[model samples]
Target: TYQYNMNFEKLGKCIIINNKNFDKVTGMGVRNGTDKDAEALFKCFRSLGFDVIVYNDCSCAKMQDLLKKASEEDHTNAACFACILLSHGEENVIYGKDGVTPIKDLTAHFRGARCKTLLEKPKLFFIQACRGTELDDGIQKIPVEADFLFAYSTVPGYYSWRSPGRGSWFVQALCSILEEHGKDLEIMQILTRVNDRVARHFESQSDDPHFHEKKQIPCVVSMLTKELYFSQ
Candidate 1:
């Protein structure tokens, strides 16, 4: 195990928003299934000692406000922050029934300059939606140590897999990994396991030859140099 210099405070003071309805007029994805998955995820994270807060079926405007308000609060009294977004999204963008907004717009608020206390700490986001439909072979596959880690549900420009009968492939695998190995494994170790499971278990659902059966690998932007466990 790698030694961490600072005191490690694990998962704490997290908010989970489960958007089950996509403002029908916009023709986005339904929310019940995804929100249920979010609820399940909330429970999972809670087991790890986070004070989980959840919001159901929020609009784009409200969603933006909510996140902004959250980032402004004091996380210095807590360990870290986590957010799981379940909705229709694209590269650098996420959608609510009313309209679309940039993913960076949501995340950038909590950056080192803004959330100074959490500057060198970890911020995790698990996004489940479409990025785009382009996956070229990468020249290298190693994660750099950093403070933020985004476990995107899909890669850039690709469709993520979700079934009406079976929830999303990403969240399910996520639940499984955390349940089976969260306490036993390091963050990178379990997330790498998540990548392996998602890559091997999921494929695109479209009929287009180039788009279907396509593969996506999980993204981890980690700056953590210590073993981060669920217990604070």
Candidate 2:
């Protein structure tokens, strides 16, 4: 794990961003896929007094500009930072309509020298998209954690869940959990419920009849030290 010093009390200011439109071209701007989900999640965070900004699918240039400008701002004087992306993705990257882009490149803007303000507060990213093109009978067992969490909709090398009509399964569960638990539960506490709900509630269908009914689970890796609550 990565180690560093972080200020805690200043955990109030937050910016929430969600992308669904892709450079005004390519990708079937699927239904309730990115846009809807991000907004739903945004509402939850906003109610807690966090400032939120969202973008539909954007070009690589726009993507760069958004983060670049965002990182330059002084958020360290704030409380926490949060972001969510609903787009096509690969093992170590995500696409921004312009083309494939590294996930690190998207997030690094807030790391180290970038956005020094939120270097070590609670930076949460909820990604709902495929990591790669692979299927699995189940998720491989993994270790546990204390802080910083990356909640992935699917495992690496596999398709994430989506609905041409209904929203993605992961986001559905996320909103439900946030609404139900936001007021009382701690941050990780809510995520743990998210994990359980996604693992048990979602199943997929495809052209191949036999291939249908495949299940996917939400993932969480956290480095939080204390309880987190969304106060009014």
Candidate 3:
């Protein structure tokens, strides 16, 4: 009874917003290697039985409308929903190709009162973006409208490292963990490993002394009233 019911007709939708390019005016650089993350995520989530859809280079309005439209759909026969955001961000805002939008604005469309069919079903959000401009030195809440989980790539007030060749540290670990343990591990357990892998296995390298050897750790905020598993 502690686990969310994964017995519905479908495992539900996973919307991946892979923002790789940005408008020059937005002052955000292209996020190289995001395609690798998206590809890996598509395969990983699909393997878990999700109907995965990937959106590339969405504008702020486009991102808004996409999720809004998704929330408006009938999910009565589905088990849960997920959205992955890969973009340039500052604090609580994520960038669309054209501009920035508050993260809450995108997620607000799926609140229980708004998306009745998904009410009480887990809505998982995976964000690979920097929370702020600070560099992490290395150091270490639930609300109940209760079943949303946010897996953030970095802790608040820090930079999330990415390798132009290897994609993002957080996402790579996430997909790897999901591939290996997704069906067997509880959702929290899966994310915990992602956190550990990112923290221990990754360190930034840049010619600039200040940017070299930097470290990062992922963050998870869960509000589920019951445990969740991707397995059938």
Candidate 4:
């Protein structure tokens, strides 16, 4: 009983900003397997018929420039806009190669009024990064004239899990859900499944007992006025 039919082909560009290494002054560790995460995202979104593009290791200014440029495009010909950020982050900020940037700063460029082309169209953001070093111990909007869904890998003040080889838990779940159900499920439903996968199926595995046996749950915020489903 899905009401919307978001034609997947030419469904706007899925811009992926995959930040891995940081500048020396940033005091951040290299994110291993993030490249794989980007690759997996590229494939998953491509399969769903999005024009996927990956930008790697961008500085704060560069990321801003990229998104601003993308936001200026004529998305009226397409269905929606999608973005993925794989990086080190904090409660409200994401790290760039040079320094930190508020997540909102990046997203604001694509707002409905600013990015008029995508107005009334869905704008999806999937961020795979830690909101903070703290770990999660336990753990709504309109259509047309409204649509921005931010999917965070972990809760505020919590660590997002990742494996040296398997990639971040959130991206893994996101790709799998999109691959298996993107065509049939609504956006929120797919993300709910991602939440379940990350919360129940994945756990931390670190040499530090403090990090071991840890749990994580994704956070999703939407201002979508109507349901969104990617269909053929």
Candidate 5:
């Protein structure tokens, strides 16, 4: 096997927030298969050598607090950080157990200037939630000053695909891609495969006309000054 220069002990942690339960008022229903997604993700990243942990059913404020606390940790010795949020979301907001939260608010805690310990190191966020109610018919498809990559489940104003039992289309492809190619391909290339999988292979199945036949695509924004790959 080919190997690259990577530090395992210092590679950093993976924080997964699996929001499976929502308050009755939010009008947000329960996410049945999110826990499966979370467990799969936790196992996958841990196998990749990340210090992976999962938090379930958090309020908006609690989510922010958790991230804020995590950001304050000493990551100076780590190589990078990763986060995954599986929840109900709008165009730019994720629903907490009780309310909604801005996506940026969660990520801002890891800004280079703020989280000096992780400065110049990669901070990756993987979001598995709907950006909106709109749908993608058949279109194909940032980062930061240095190292921030966002792998969004769907484009703006669109519903992301979740299989209820099989989990989300995005995370299924994400876990599979990383499992097979984590040690070889660049991060972008891995996500490109995810996009292709979600866009080309998966489709919605439901009785509702809107959900009967639908399509979805993942979006990636990268701002890593250099490429990223997982290897020993």
Candidate 6:
């Protein structure tokens, strides 16, 4: 079949790493509204029947260890795995409370050779972070070990916006679309809706006029060999 089986005993585990507080040496400020993102993601994933778990303020080593342990667990009865990262980031690295870590270092733990039980199953990652300091003046544009998807908050070399009160623009659209169509729509279709929402319904509002009224778009990288749906 061209669809991942969603009839497993469980929908699988989702790990949300919310890194709000940064170490002084890291030079990153506290992510004030990320708690709202974490809360919304927790509710959304749980509603889809995932065994959702949230971790806050982890260091680089701790982030590695957490995903390593999760990958080591047996997932024979589960349908897939998901991880969400909320932190300060650069082009290819995500911030742990203390420092930056290559995103690949964290995801490599679940390669088919290392995590056999989850082989061929979907491994989804949603990252909410700034890819760089560059603002999107507008205009456009991952083959993991197969069956992996990265839904990034913004295009590479661009900043991802966050509100002190409402959470991030990307995550808000993601959660809302997921809540509405997660069970009925195919994974890519659902993400497309999120992309549309984030693009059309949002624009940056900053006191710095250079940053004001700026546009943003989410990026989705997929290597899935089959369609994925949350519903049975």
Candidate 4: residue 26 Cα off by (Å): 0.3
Models 1 onward score TM values of: 0.82, 0.79, 0.95, 0.92, 0.92, 0.95
RMSD of each predicted structure = 4.2, 4.8, 1.9, 3.3, 3.0, 1.8
Q: Count the backbone clashes (under 3 Å) in each candidate.
A: 9, 16, 0, 5, 2, 0
- Candidate 4 structure quality by residue, lDDT tens digits, 1-232: 3343464447788989999888899999888899888999999999988899899999999889988899988876788888888889886788999999887778888766998878778888888876378764443011223578889887777887788888888888999989999989888999999998987867665677677656778899888777888884
What is the Å distance of residue 206 in model 2 from its true position? 2.9
Whole-model Cα lDDT per candidate? Answer: 0.69, 0.64, 0.86, 0.82, 0.81, 0.87
Candidate 6 colliding pairs: none
Highest lDDT among the candidates is held by which one? 6
Per-residue lDDT tens digits for candidate 5, residues 116-204, read 87877788899888537766554330234568888898777877767779888888888998888887888889999989887777775
Better of 3 and 5 by TM-score: 3
What does candidate 6's lDDT look like per residue over 31-65, in tens digits?
98899999999999999899999999999999999
User: Ten residues in a row with the worst lDDT in model 5?
Assistant: 136-145
Runs in model 1 lying further than 4 Å from the true structure:
1-10, 131-146, 203-212, 225-227
Query: What is candidate 4's CA lDDT for residue 230?
Result: 83
Q: Pairing residues by index, what is the TM-score of model 3? A: 0.95
Compose the digit string of candidate 2's lDDT tens values, residues 130-232: 5356665543311122234577877677766667557777777878888877767777778788878777755565666645556767677665665556652
Instruction: For candidate 5, report its TM-score.
Output: 0.92
Q: Is candidate 2 or candidate 5 better by TM-score?
A: 5
